[PDB]
Amino acid sequence: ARQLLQQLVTSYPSTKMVIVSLHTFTLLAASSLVDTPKQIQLLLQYLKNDPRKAVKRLAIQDLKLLANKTPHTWSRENIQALCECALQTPYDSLKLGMLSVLSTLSGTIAIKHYFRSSDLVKLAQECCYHNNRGIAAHGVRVLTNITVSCQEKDLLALEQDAVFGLESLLVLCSQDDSPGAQATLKIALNCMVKLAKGRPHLSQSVVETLLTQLHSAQDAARILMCHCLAAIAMQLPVLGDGMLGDLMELYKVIGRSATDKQQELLVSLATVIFVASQKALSVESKAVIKQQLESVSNGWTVYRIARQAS
Amino acid sequence: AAADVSVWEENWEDDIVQDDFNQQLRLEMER
Amino acid sequence: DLAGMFLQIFPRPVALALQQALGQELARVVQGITVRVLQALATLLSSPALVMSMHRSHFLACPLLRQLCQYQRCVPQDTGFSSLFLKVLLQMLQWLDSPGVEGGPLRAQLRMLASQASAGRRLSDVRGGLLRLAEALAFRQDLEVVSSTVRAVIATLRSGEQCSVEPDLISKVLQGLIEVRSPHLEELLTAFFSAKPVVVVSSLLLQ
């Protein structure tokens, strides 16, 4: 079947025919998992050489499928070829696709098999400062995965590159309040949570970035960063004391004008208040009760905040 | 071509699953 | 002031405040200080350095350049901001092209920004540009120049009308681009055949 599919791709090089044939070859390689290395090599060859954007897009989708299925079978040469392709392509959609494949790979053991300043790190650093938000999210995800998975001390210089890329991505995604921006914001905040777990000495800077960005972000973004702060403070409660002032101030200013979307913001803020409080509450408790009783006729908000308190 | 990931993996606010008890409680006490 | 702001950032929370201010300005503009900070940066680049400090601290410089480019993209009709942005990008490229600095994310980001800026402009002569491409592809050197010229030709074909045919010239250029394996072949063919194409394609396939 492999020989027949090779004969088909060489002898029927139409866009439809080559797409169906390459997808079928990829699925056959995934099912048989013996030709999978040379299938990856073939897909990278088509990605690099074939100029058709559709063929490249299929190659990206198939490599993402193989990365999800058999990341361990990827060699160093395969990842090097993919990184080179991502580096020297001019089109942003294709670059975003290859970085999606590479971010899938970096979350697996393929990163350990890949290992200095290599093409992967150079690409990830270049991509995390891209104008495109999706490319930036994928690049900073690759950087975060490298930082938390590889404790090798030759690449601790990108530890702060990862932190600052996450912070810049926060600044980029906070004001938009658009679904694509919300998706990139979720990616960035998940990466920050992962980075706080993996490298606890960076937790203070991550928390400070989140707190400073809380005062200048939209409501949906505020809810997402409240979830991020709740995660970080649940795992590392020592940072709770440092975030109480900013969170309480934002709780005061939100509750004065809390109309429709601020109910979710109110429960998120109360959740981080309760999580970040190692001890009980005396004045913060009074502030929360006052903010509830003053305006909130929404019983559901009160119930969810009481659930978090208990 | 996208994927979904959650910022906080024990966040009780996610509406991924809606149960009857909380449904009637919400519909009964939300204003 | 802003010059002192720059001399305090690169050689840290104040840079965070600057980033927040730039984001606020971007949100305000897209809903309805950037020029001041850009002019301060340009005047500082005029005097003697700061680029090497931005190279060693690219995690500060690159978000700022990203914010400024997004400002430029939001309001491209505000001429004077875009020209000065291109000027400072070229100034940094001149100041960073020395071999001793080695690699760096900052250089790649600036080169990408310059290429993006140079792609949004037309080119006058289709025949002249195509002949330029023909001999440039004959030497097969200056691949960045080749890519920029092909992008200009694509923009020209997007906006302009069809110039002289010259099937031999167009076939030679297509064959050369196939040999060099440029990534812009598909876009070039789309732009070319949007405007004889069958004879050209058949002759290319036969060879």
From Swiss-Prot, chain A:
Compartment(s) where it occurs, according to its Swiss-Prot or TrEMBL record: Nucleus; Chromosome; Cytoplasm
Domain of life: Eukaryota
Spans through the membrane: none
Oligomer and partners: Component of the Integrator complex, composed of core subunits INTS1, INTS2, INTS3, INTS4, INTS5, INTS6, INTS7, INTS8, INTS9/RC74, INTS10, INTS11/CPSF3L, INTS12, INTS13, INTS14 and INTS15. The core complex associates with protein phosphatase 2A subunits PPP2CA and PPP2R1A, to form the Integrator-PP2A (INTAC) complex. Interacts with NABP2.
Protein family: Belongs to the Integrator subunit 7 family.
The protein's role, per its UniProt record: Component of the integrator complex, a multiprotein complex that terminates RNA polymerase II (Pol II) transcription in the promoter-proximal region of genes.
The protein, known as: Integrator complex subunit 7
Gene name of this polypeptide: INTS7
Residues of the full protein shown: 214 to 534 of 962
From Swiss-Prot, chain C:
Compartments, record wording: Nucleus; Nucleus membrane
Portion of the full sequence shown: 1351 to 1589 of 2190
Function: Component of the integrator complex, a multiprotein complex that terminates RNA polymerase II (Pol II) transcription in the promoter-proximal region of genes.
The name this protein goes by in its record: Integrator complex subunit 1
Gene: INTS1
Disease: Neurodevelopmental disorder with cataracts, poor growth, and dysmorphic facies: An autosomal recessive neurodevelopmental disorder characterized by severe global developmental delay with motor impairment, cognitive delays, absent or severely limited speech, dysmorphic features, hypotonia and cataracts.
Subunit structure: Component of the Integrator complex, composed of core subunits INTS1, INTS2, INTS3, INTS4, INTS5, INTS6, INTS7, INTS8, INTS9/RC74, INTS10, INTS11/CPSF3L, INTS12, INTS13, INTS14 and INTS15. The core complex associates with protein phosphatase 2A subunits PPP2CA and PPP2R1A, to form the Integrator-PP2A (INTAC) complex. Interacts with ESRRB, ESRRB is not a core component of the Integrator complex and this association is a bridge for the interaction with the multiprotein complex Integrator; attracts the transcriptional machinery.
Record family assignment: Belongs to the Integrator subunit 1 family.
Superkingdom of the organism of origin: Eukaryota
Organism annotation: Homo sapiens (Human)
